[PDB]
């Protein structure tokens, strides 16, 4: 019953995603239908900005307007041009995004520049906050690699106003891992910002067994009631099929 | 010849150098920006999908051609009749930094008998663009409208709704720009007397210097040789550029 319990919980915390070079309106429409499962709705969908308008219409017409729409900006590169990252974020807001997952300029941080990351996140947060849009920040743990760098990127993002810190883009060699997730959640804990900052493991999370492990870390650090939609999301795709299977669907 | 060479340079400077492919990337757009800066002059603009505007702007600036405009497309290529969606995409295009937005008119709705939605859609998008000092071109998709009466009607509605340019096609259907469609649309501009405020843009399938010459000849005939400047005429094309340069000995 433990795996079934965690699987249903994980399903309801999913940011059902599709960020492929071959994405089409038709594929996103299908994703919206998938988000409305036989056992409940996912927390949201995560798609490229251009698909937001049609996705919003699709979710509304099937009676699931509560399924949030997240998107990505400064993605997947995480370049350090704040003007470009901000323009993309403002465009995402204009398209109608409920949430924007922006990529932190991690290569700049690896090069010893902590200021550009703070300013980039802050600028995007200011834009999102003014539009009642939540901002998640992707630090790309797989590329940062070192615990110190993962902690630093998390810390900077939090100080700059991140509403969520996310592990990866799903576009690099290594993405979410239990180890990286624990480090990032430890930062939220050490900074005492668990009430205002959520966590989102993303990329490579494909099985119900994996999801259970990620939620176990959250429960361990913040108590079993902490991981609600405002504080936890699963950036995944095929994971949904695995969760549904564990639930007999 | 001499006339052909002259029309080719003129057409080059009026080109909205385009790339709107499913396999487009930042790299391909950067290459497009480089192509827009030719040895005999710069194209009037580039036309790309909204998401590529920021990097395109940076690329044009770094190569010393900030005067090359950036046009994009919305409600594309479908021309659906949902005004909220068309408007949202247009506002996003503006936010990305577009100088011009080429929106697709709800042509199937018009064909089904709805003249009002086209007026309302263009008007809503024009309002957003004008508020940001962005020009709005309206694609009526002549290849699908097919009939002369429908082409004139879509052009008239678009103009009344505030179009800054009327454009023939998306380039995503079989039949796009044709000399006949261009003449019909320009005749509407002439008949309505809006040549000072409304430009024309033949788009799709315009591949040769010879073709470009014919399209410009129609404009010169109807409005005089000095009418077709960047604010009033553009070529929505891609491979055309190579043909124009070849005609010029480049």
From Swiss-Prot, chain B:
It is found in: Cytoplasm. Optimum pH is 7.5 for 2-deoxy-D-ribose 5-phosphate cleavage. Its main location: cytoplasm. Pathway: Carbohydrate degradation; 2-deoxy-D-ribose 1-phosphate degradation; D-glyceraldehyde 3-phosphate and acetaldehyde from 2-deoxy-alpha-D-ribose 1-phosphate: step 2/2. Pfam families: DeoC (PF01791). Keywords: Acetylation, Cytoplasm, Lyase, Schiff base. It is an enzyme of class 4 (lyase). Catalyzes a reversible aldol reaction between acetaldehyde and D-glyceraldehyde 3-phosphate to generate 2-deoxy-D-ribose 5-phosphate. Can also catalyze the double aldol condensation of three acetaldehyde molecules, leading to the formation of 2,4,6-trideoxyhexose. HAMAP family: DeoC_type2. This is Deoxyribose-phosphate aldolase. The lineage of its organism: Bacteria, Pseudomonadati, Pseudomonadota, Gammaproteobacteria, Enterobacterales.
């Amino acid at each position: 019953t433990d795996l079934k319990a965690s699987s249903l919980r994980a399903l309801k915390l999913m940011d059902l995603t599709t960020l492929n070079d071959d994405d089409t309106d038709e594929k996103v429409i299908a994703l919206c239908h998938q988000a409305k499962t036989p056992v409940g709705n996912t927390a949201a969908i995560c798609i490229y900005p251009r698909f937001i308008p049609i996705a919003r219409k699709t979710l509304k017409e099937q009676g699931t307007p509560e399924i949030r729409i997240a998107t990505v900006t400064n993605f997947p590169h995480g370049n350090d041009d704040i003007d470009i990252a901000l323009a993309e974020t403002r465009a995402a807001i204009a398209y109608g995004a409920d949430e924007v997952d922006v990529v932190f300029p991690y290569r700049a941080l690896m090069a010893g520049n902590e200021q550009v990351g703070f300013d980039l996140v802050k600028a995007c947060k200011e834009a999102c906050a003014a539009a009642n849009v939540l901002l998640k920040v992707i630090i790309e743990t797989g590329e940062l690699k070192d615990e110190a760098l993962i902690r630093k990127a998390s810390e900077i993002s939090i100080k700059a106003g991140a509403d969520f810190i996310k592990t990866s883009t799903g576009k690099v060699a290594v993405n979410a891992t239990p180890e990286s997730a624990r480090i990032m959640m430890e930062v939220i804990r050490d900074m005492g910002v668990e009430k205002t900052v959520g966590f989102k493991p993303a990329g490579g999370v494909r099985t119900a067994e994996d999801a259970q492990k990620y939620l176990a870390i959250a429960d361990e650090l913040f108590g079993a009631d902490w991981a609600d939609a405002r504080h936890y999301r699963f950036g995944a795709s095929s994971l949904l099929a695995s969760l549904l299977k564990a639930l007999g669907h």
